[PDB]
Amino acid sequence: TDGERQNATEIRASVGKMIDGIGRFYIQMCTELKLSDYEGRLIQNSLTIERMVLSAFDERRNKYLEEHPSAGKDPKKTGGPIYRRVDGKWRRELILYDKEEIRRIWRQANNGDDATAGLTHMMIWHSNLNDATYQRTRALVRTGMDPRMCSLMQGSTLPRRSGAAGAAVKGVGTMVMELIRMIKRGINDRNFWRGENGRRTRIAYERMCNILKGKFQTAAQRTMVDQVRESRNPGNAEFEDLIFLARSALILRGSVAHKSCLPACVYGSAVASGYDFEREGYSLVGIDPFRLLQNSQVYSLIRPNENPAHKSQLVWMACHSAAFEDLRVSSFIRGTKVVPRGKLSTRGVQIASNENMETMESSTLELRSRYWAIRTRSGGNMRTEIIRLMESARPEDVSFQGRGVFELSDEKATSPIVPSFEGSYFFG
Amino acid sequence: TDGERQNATEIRASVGKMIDGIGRFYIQMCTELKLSDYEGRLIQNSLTIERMVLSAFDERRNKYLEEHPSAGKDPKKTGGPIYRRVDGKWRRELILYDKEEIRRIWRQANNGDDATAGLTHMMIWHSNLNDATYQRTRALVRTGMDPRMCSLMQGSTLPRRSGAAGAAVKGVGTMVMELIRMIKRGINDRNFWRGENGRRTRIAYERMCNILKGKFQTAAQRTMVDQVRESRNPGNAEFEDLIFLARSALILRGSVAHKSCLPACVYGSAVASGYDFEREGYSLVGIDPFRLLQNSQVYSLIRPNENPAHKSQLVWMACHSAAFEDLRVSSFIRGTKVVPRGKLSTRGVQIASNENMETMESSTLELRSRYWAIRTRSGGNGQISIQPTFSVQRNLPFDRPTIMAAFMRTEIIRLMESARPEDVSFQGRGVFELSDEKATSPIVPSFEGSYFFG
Amino acid sequence: ERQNATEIRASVGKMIDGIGRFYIQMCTELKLSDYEGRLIQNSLTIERMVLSAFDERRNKYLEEHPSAGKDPKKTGGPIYRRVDGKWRRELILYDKEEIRRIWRQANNGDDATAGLTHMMIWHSNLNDATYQRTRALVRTGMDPRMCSLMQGSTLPRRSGAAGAAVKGVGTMVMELIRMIKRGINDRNFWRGENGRRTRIAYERMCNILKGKFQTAAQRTMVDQVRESRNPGNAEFEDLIFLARSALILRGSVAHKSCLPACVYGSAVASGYDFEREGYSLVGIDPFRLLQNSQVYSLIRPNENPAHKSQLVWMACHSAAFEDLRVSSFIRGTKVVPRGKLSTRGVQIASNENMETMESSTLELRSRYWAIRTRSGGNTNSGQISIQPTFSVQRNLPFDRPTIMAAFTTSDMRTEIIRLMESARPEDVSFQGRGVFELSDEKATSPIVPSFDMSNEGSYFFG
Amino acid sequence: ERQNATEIRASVGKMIDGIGRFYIQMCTELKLSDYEGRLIQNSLTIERMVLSAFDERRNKYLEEHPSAGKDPKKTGGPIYRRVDGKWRRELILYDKEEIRRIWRQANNGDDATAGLTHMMIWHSNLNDATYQRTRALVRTGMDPRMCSLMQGSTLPRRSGAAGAAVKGVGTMVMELIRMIKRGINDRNFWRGENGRRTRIAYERMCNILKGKFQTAAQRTMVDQVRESRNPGNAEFEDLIFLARSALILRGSVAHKSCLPACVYGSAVASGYDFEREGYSLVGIDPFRLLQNSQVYSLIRPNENPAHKSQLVWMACHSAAFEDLRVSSFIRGTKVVPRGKLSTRGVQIASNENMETMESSTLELRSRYWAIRTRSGGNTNSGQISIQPTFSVQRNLPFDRPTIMAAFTTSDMRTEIIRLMESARPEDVSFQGRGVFELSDEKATSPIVPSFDMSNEGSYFFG
Amino acid sequence: SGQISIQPTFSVQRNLPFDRPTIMAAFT
RNA sequence: UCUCUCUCUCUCUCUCUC
RNA sequence: UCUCUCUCUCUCUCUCUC
RNA sequence: CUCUCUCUCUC
RNA sequence: UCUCUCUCUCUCUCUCUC
Ligand SMILES: *[C][C]([O])[C]O[C][C][C][N]C(=O)C1=[C]C(C2=C3[C]=[C]C(=O)[C]C3=OC3=C2[C]=[C]C(=O)[C]3)=C(C([O])=O)[C]=[C]1
Ligand SMILES: *[C][C]([O])[C]O[C][C][C][N]C(=O)C1=[C]C(C2=C3[C]=[C]C(=O)[C]C3=OC3=C2[C]=[C]C(=O)[C]3)=C(C([O])=O)[C]=[C]1
Numbered sequence A: 001t002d003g004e005r006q007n008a009t010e011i012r013a014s015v016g017k018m019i020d021g022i023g024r025f026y027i028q029m030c031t032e033l034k035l036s037d038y039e040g041r042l043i044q045n046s047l048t049i050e051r052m053v054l055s056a057f058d059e060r061r062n063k064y065l066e067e068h069p070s071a072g073k074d075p076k077k078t079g080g081p082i083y084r085r086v087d088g089k090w091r092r093e094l095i096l097y098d099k100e101e102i103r104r105i106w107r108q109a110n111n112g113d114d115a116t117a118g119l120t121h122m123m124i125w126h127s128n129l130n131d132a133t134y135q136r137t138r139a140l141v142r143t144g145m146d147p148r149m150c151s152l153m154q155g156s157t158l159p160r161r162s163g164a165a166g167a168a169v170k171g172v173g174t175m176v177m178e179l180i181r182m183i184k185r186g187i188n189d190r191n192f193w194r195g196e197n198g199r200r201t202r203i204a205y206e207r208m209c210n211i212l213k214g215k216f217q218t219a220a221q222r223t224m225v226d227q228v229r230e231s232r233n234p235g236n237a238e239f240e241d242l243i244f245l246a247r248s249a250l251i252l253r254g255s256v257a258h259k260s261c262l263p264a265c266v267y268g269s270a271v272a273s274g275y276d277f278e279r280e281g282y283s284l285v286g287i288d289p290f291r292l293l294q295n296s297q298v299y300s301l302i303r304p305n306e307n308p309a310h311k312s313q314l315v316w317m318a319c320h321s322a323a324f325e326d327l328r329v330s331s332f333i334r335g336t337k338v339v340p341r342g343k344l345s346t347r348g349v350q351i352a353s354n355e356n357m358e359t360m361e362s363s364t365l366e367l368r369s370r371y372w373a374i375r376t377r378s379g380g381n382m383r384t385e386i387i388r389l390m391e392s393a394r395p396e397d398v399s400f401q402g403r404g405v406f407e408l409s410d411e412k413a414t415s416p417i418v419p420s421f422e423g424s425y426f427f428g
Numbered sequence B: 001t002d003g004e005r006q007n008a009t010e011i012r013a014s015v016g017k018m019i020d021g022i023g024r025f026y027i028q029m030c031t032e033l034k035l036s037d038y039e040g041r042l043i044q045n046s047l048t049i050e051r052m053v054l055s056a057f058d059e060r061r062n063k064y065l066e067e068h069p070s071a072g073k074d075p076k077k078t079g080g081p082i083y084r085r086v087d088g089k090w091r092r093e094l095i096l097y098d099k100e101e102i103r104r105i106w107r108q109a110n111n112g113d114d115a116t117a118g119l120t121h122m123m124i125w126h127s128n129l130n131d132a133t134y135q136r137t138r139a140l141v142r143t144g145m146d147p148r149m150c151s152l153m154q155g156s157t158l159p160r161r162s163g164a165a166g167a168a169v170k171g172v173g174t175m176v177m178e179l180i181r182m183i184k185r186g187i188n189d190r191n192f193w194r195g196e197n198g199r200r201t202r203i204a205y206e207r208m209c210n211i212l213k214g215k216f217q218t219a220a221q222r223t224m225v226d227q228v229r230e231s232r233n234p235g236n237a238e239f240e241d242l243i244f245l246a247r248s249a250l251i252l253r254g255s256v257a258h259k260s261c262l263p264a265c266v267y268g269s270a271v272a273s274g275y276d277f278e279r280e281g282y283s284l285v286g287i288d289p290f291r292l293l294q295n296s297q298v299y300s301l302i303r304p305n306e307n308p309a310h311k312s313q314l315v316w317m318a319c320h321s322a323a324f325e326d327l328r329v330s331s332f333i334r335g336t337k338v339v340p341r342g343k344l345s346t347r348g349v350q351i352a353s354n355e356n357m358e359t360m361e362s363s364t365l366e367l368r369s370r371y372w373a374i375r376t377r378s379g380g381n382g383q384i385s386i387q388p389t390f391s392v393q394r395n396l397p398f399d400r401p402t403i404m405a406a407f408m409r410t411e412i413i414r415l416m417e418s419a420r421p422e423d424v425s426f427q428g429r430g431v432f433e434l435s436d437e438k439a440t441s442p443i444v445p446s447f448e449g450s451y452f453f454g
Numbered sequence C, D: 001e002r003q004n005a006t007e008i009r010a011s012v013g014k015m016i017d018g019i020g021r022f023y024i025q026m027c028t029e030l031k032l033s034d035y036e037g038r039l040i041q042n043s044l045t046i047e048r049m050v051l052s053a054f055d056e057r058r059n060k061y062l063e064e065h066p067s068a069g070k071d072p073k074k075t076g077g078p079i080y081r082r083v084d085g086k087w088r089r090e091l092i093l094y095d096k097e098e099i100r101r102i103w104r105q106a107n108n109g110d111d112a113t114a115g116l117t118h119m120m121i122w123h124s125n126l127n128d129a130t131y132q133r134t135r136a137l138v139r140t141g142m143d144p145r146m147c148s149l150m151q152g153s154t155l156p157r158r159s160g161a162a163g164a165a166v167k168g169v170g171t172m173v174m175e176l177i178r179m180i181k182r183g184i185n186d187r188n189f190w191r192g193e194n195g196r197r198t199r200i201a202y203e204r205m206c207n208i209l210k211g212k213f214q215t216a217a218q219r220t221m222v223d224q225v226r227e228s229r230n231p232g233n234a235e236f237e238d239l240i241f242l243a244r245s246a247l248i249l250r251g252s253v254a255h256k257s258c259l260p261a262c263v264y265g266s267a268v269a270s271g272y273d274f275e276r277e278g279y280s281l282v283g284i285d286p287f288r289l290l291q292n293s294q295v296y297s298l299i300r301p302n303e304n305p306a307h308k309s310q311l312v313w314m315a316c317h318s319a320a321f322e323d324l325r326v327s328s329f330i331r332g333t334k335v336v337p338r339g340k341l342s343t344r345g346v347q348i349a350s351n352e353n354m355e356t357m358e359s360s361t362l363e364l365r366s367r368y369w370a371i372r373t374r375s376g377g378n379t380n381s382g383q384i385s386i387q388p389t390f391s392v393q394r395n396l397p398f399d400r401p402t403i404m405a406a407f408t409t410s411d412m413r414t415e416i417i418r419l420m421e422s423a424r425p426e427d428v429s430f431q432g433r434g435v436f437e438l439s440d441e442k443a444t445s446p447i448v449p450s451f452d453m454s455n456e457g458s459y460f461f462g
Numbered sequence E: 001s002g003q004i005s006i007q008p009t010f011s012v013q014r015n016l017p018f019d020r021p022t023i024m025a026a027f028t
Numbered sequence F, G, I: 001u002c003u004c005u006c007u008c009u010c011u012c013u014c015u016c017u018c
Numbered sequence H: 001c002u003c004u005c006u007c008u009c010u011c
């Protein structure tokens, strides 16, 4: 410390410049799509705008679309459902946009720089929303993993384009599933792991194994993942130890980074208010996301016979990536009880084409929390040794000793408020 | 998802390329055998052409034929019955073709590559037709298996040449029969499981045990198969143990892949119509086969005193591999009642040599379904931990008994007693309309027999 | 065990005697004098006549497609005669059927292909010691620096298993790579009856290459190369990797001393019954034959006869890729590298000025003699385990990894790389083996060389 | 292996024959006499006519944007005629479609771009031997002293891979640096469809530059330069470093003898079938062609015809950046440096006084001939390892670093600097290679030069 | 200024000359 | 019925007229 | 009535003239 | 690990 | 330019003890 103050201040400015680009670009696209103040603050509109940018910068998929065009869709144009309110009622119209025009607007909003950080930030926000809304046991069962480890699927929907930043936020289950797919492909195809492309696959297999090893904490888990990496031709045996490693993560949890990626509508509103994130700085693990959400007002489209509070809770959890967190700690921070997924009277935020966009009304999302906490990249505290470690482990050991929850008025996190604690499983 | 869209698109193109080869090959063979449009669309003619291809690429059998030639049949020529309509009457003439000539024609149609995927696709189509038409209880009894487990006989006629692709579509009962025959040969021959060949047989035994194990869903069934695999000298103990496994599959059904493999005449007509499977892609479990059959007209030979509708239903059943599926669900999708096998007034599609090919008439097959559904590779039928997100002093809870729990025969019997023939499976999944190409609005049915082979 | 050895010696001696008496008959029919009959160039011409007469497929092709201005039933070559001390070259033509009849009469009515393969190996060794094959190496995509593995690259296909043992890892890899390249260019390769035949040839060549290798990882990798139905770029790259690995973890290449037919003919005319005495291509017999034999050669103006004699010696003993220090120790005279040899090839071209050419005696004599080996060294045998004799507490030791490796990932490239990384260019192989004096016929007392003085060069082609 | 070589020779001879017969047709259509047809300036004009007719992109641009007072469908140039012993220049205009038709008829209805590239390389070599490119060097930020790497700097883009082999490391570095500078000025470079095209061009140019280099460190550094998405100042500085390193650890630049079309036309009119005999741009064929060919040139008043002939000889053999000692040894006459040549360029300007101009015969004859090389020397091939023949104890040697370097910090600048620091300007490269007499067609007996007398200069531009 | 180094054209034995102090002084 | 130690041969095609 | 520490000797036969 | 990383992908 | 909470509602496989 006393030397990392400068480093911390430098990092804050760089993140603020990314958020400023996200906000500046959203403002331009809202002004260029001709969206009113209400429609601009709709979460459905923000997702559509975000998805347009992400697809506009997908070089690989765009190339494949050019080479092998789809039916009725030219590969040079993107878009999505844009919801406009005129005369009280809501209607949806598909907007088509050149991917190059979207790219120019995004680049100009970032002072002519690619700014791949902003795109990955939006990608993490979508993954957080998907994790809190949809549970992918089909992929777990399809790959041969037990569907009970749904707590390790953090960031399973993130595309491979989010490197480094994306891998930091994704969980052990997603990393294992990626490796298991590689093993399944290698077992099926004998030419896998061989030739020039096999060498490229090998380096990818090694690198993704290395990040999985760094995700673990106990020395035993790192050594076993080290063994799995050394296998030149991994097969069923490496299949099993990865499954065992995944099961051990439920007790000896890994270190998964948690960042609060807000929807682009919140950033656009803040930038229009004159907030200079570059000057004041930003942070995805501190109070800045919480203080932004407190002063931010966002609307959503509510399907008939749906509780706005439950939808607002879903967005609140996705914003802070609390999908797999303890319900008691999530409830304590928010101030209103967080209900498990099975008891939520709501469907996903995104509205499908086959849905009659005429009985849909809009509601204000309550994305405000009574308390605020710091997001953690840490967990808590051969093979027989691994089983021995989790036998000693009990579901009562106290973690994060002395670390609590602060007040929105306590911007320096000086006085923690330790909670004292009936379910605790969102997907249970 | 959003990353598996690309992979889904890749697979669609690869299967579409296979379908294109079959159609391109069929068109080439039709113009080389000099068949008109009606004869080109005959299912019997397509069967002969498909079988000629499969025999031309049978490397092992062809080698055996060369070494030990049959009587009056040179091992370099293949063929079959080709039916031509002259002056309104039908006649059959046996066509002989060089296997090298057929192999070259097939390879040229697939851009010079072997494309064994197209061959396995045709073999699956023949297997589906055999399953819907003929019931092999004689093989079940001869291996010692109870003749009642005919629901697990999916792909029992598939040759060993169909690996992976063929093995995925074959069922638990057929897999068990393969294991049993291996066991019987070991019991009869002491040299089995010993010597250089015994090593090869052991690896083959291991591989098909693993794929059989992956076919099951309950943990108890998988553990039971794992024990049988470990046996170095399998005998009656594994014989009985596998028999129990097959009986258990009737209640705790395994995962059998179901694909709609159509006759090559359908693909040939589609390709000749300018249709590009490689461009728009294809899928054997989606709406593509259903949409193809709606626009496709196929003729067949109908023997005297045979209901054309019943033969068409048999071909419809074979096309979608619904031989062992519920009659009520099949009747709902087709739109016309599906009859059990015992009430089908028709014999097999393939015509015999000894049959008087002069009282035979041809009819159009009604291979049209009112609805379309997704074929399943699955049979019948929460969170236990936490991941901290905030820096708080809480305790990270986990379900200790369940996590550490995962670290025989009475258990299996207990599982099936709890199961009853009323549990709803595939909850919320229904049948779509032909106009609904995106599978948006399912139509859940409300439901006298339900056994085809009953 | 001794009886089989004596029959093997008798059979090899029978082949040598047939070659020698054929040379005597050819010298009688060509009206060559003793000096002209001892010339290495005349013997080269005669041997090439034999090989071209019995090249059945080439003869048939020549009959079907005649050559330009040549009779397809006649062989020939340059025969050199000395008139008044001046050498002159002559092109004399012999019927192929006459040559075949003479050769068969030499081997007692038998078309002994073993002697033909022996002459083929002699020519291959001479070409290996004289000419480098870097252009063919570069064309096939292999580094020009693996010339040490290219032994027997000029051996034709008709040599068979006898010549296959002589050709090194580099030549086999090159031939397999040529096959893979042909398959890559044309897909109709590996299809049809020709496809089945070439698949069988590919399998056989892969199997003999696998037999060449010593370590288990190399054998596993060549096995994986063999198992591919349509070998493509990956198998060609794996073959290149194996060829490079053969530089450190060497292979089992068989080395034999195949002398020119002039020496055998002189020995047979002297009265040496190879059938009764017996001959070995890996023992003292070639050394003993070369010590008391006189061979003449044609020296072009401004050439060093010592360098030509050294070249012929290296060719005779197949020591082209041998360490220069051990070769010099065995020869007693410094074996100069190829770059500093002021001499061209043995054979004389048709355009040379046959008026300034001279004749020199070849010094094919060595101080020591050594056993020629098939092994390429140690790769890192003996006693693995202890059998207890005394009832004492003691740990009972055994080499567990070696025993277990015969009772057991799929990427053996990493294992091969690790094995070569462990090796150092200072390990001693062939431990306890030395060079024997010429009087030590039974190879009883070995002499171990101590190369620990100032360093000479080690690579002939360096 | 020989068949491919003879087809290559036949193809090159076909190109040469096409060029020569085109020159004959052009001389017939221009009504030039024999002397005027052998003038090097007239041949330069005719070749430039050919190149401008087939410059498709420039022709299209000229059609879209016409030049000032010029027909965009007509080429031309100075044609010199002798009347009463006085030389006069003429500007005659030919339709581009007529020139294209004549060229295609010369190559048998084919638009053989190989001959056009040959003439392009001849012009580039002449410009390299005549004019220095220091201003362009300084503008791009490279030292004016790396002129030895600027071979082929005047070659246009349409030459392609054939001309890419001829251009040196300096020109490729200069073009890449121009691209980087354009990217630095405007960020819209490397963006859009033009951005994708220029990224592909940058990758291809980096790859051929990497192929030019020899040592592994230089290849790794150019690979690192290629991998940058937005190359900036760092990659431009690294390119400058590589260019400076190329002065000691030289690159692989291909040198070919591309003669003026007058020589080819005279040879074709004489009756030399290049198709049957075959032609090589790196062997004796250009030397043999130049020895018996007569070429005339225009000498401005107060000039030395010997110096002009030496300049044309250097241009013909692409020996501009060659050591003066070896060039003089091959030529037999002293190759004077550029500073002491009392001569200007070959081409005559339009403002010159065409009444005092004279004509001189060019002495394009050399005493010796040598093989033109692509290699830039040794950087510090052969036999890496020993294959044991004799069963003797011995250490088995191999070159461990060389074998291992193909099986394996990230700052290779230090390694490159160390490699160049080890080198000295006294090492002998191309060992055992010499200069052959003109009668030695097959390159059998080499002559090694001994430059160990009083020192002459070595750099042409020094 | 001038030409510091030689670029070989002919395959002849020869020493390849360069101005070592001038090249090295830019690397110290 | 030929010749040779030691890759330098040949097709590679061009961001823009420059 | 013989000799020896430490497998390498020998038959293996060739996709095509190359 | 109460904040100290990120300029993207087998592109 | 898709859709979905909670067992495969689509993710093939480049053929055989040859
Ligand atoms: C054991 C052993 O024997 C095995 O082997 C294997 C190899 C051999 N083969 C060869 O060579 C060949 C083959 C063939 C064929 C084929 C191929 C491929 C596929 O896929 C199929 C097939 O089929 C067949 C054949 C033959 C014959 C018959 O009959 C069939 C060929 C062709 O085809 O051509 C060639 C070669
Ligand atoms: C890998 C191989 O195969 C290929 O490669 C290629 C390379 C070169 N090029 C490139 O890359 C480019 C790209 C681009 C783009 C971009 C850039 C950057 C970022 O970040 C993003 C992006 O995105 C996109 C693109 C394109 C297209 C689309 O769609 C998208 C470019 C531009 O943009 O311009 C160029 C080039």
Ligand SMILES: *[C][C]([O])[C]O[C][C][C][N]C(=O)C1=[C]C(C2=C3[C]=[C]C(=O)[C]C3=OC3=C2[C]=[C]C(=O)[C]3)=C(C([O])=O)[C]=[C]1
Binding pocket: C058, D001, D002, F001, F002, G017, G018
């Ligand atoms: C293929 C490989 O092996 C390589 O090849 C090349 C080298 C070797 N050789 C061979 O093989 C051959 C050769 C030949 C020839 C000849 C022979 C004999 C005589 O006498 C002469 C001759 O000539 C020649 C040749 C070739 C080429 C040229 O150029 C010349 C042959 C024939 O001829 O046939 C064969 C083989």
Ligand SMILES: *[C][C]([O])[C]O[C][C][C][N]C(=O)C1=[C]C(C2=C3[C]=[C]C(=O)[C]C3=OC3=C2[C]=[C]C(=O)[C]3)=C(C([O])=O)[C]=[C]1
Binding pocket: C001, C002, G001, G002
């Ligand atoms: C069979 C087994 O055991 C192996 O064998 C071989 C080794 C041992 N030995 C034996 O047994 C024997 C020997 C012999 C001999 C002898 C004897 C005695 C004496 O004295 C001398 C002798 O000599 C000899 C022998 C053999 C061989 C040779 O080479 C020489 C015998 C007889 O002789 O009989 C027997 C036995």
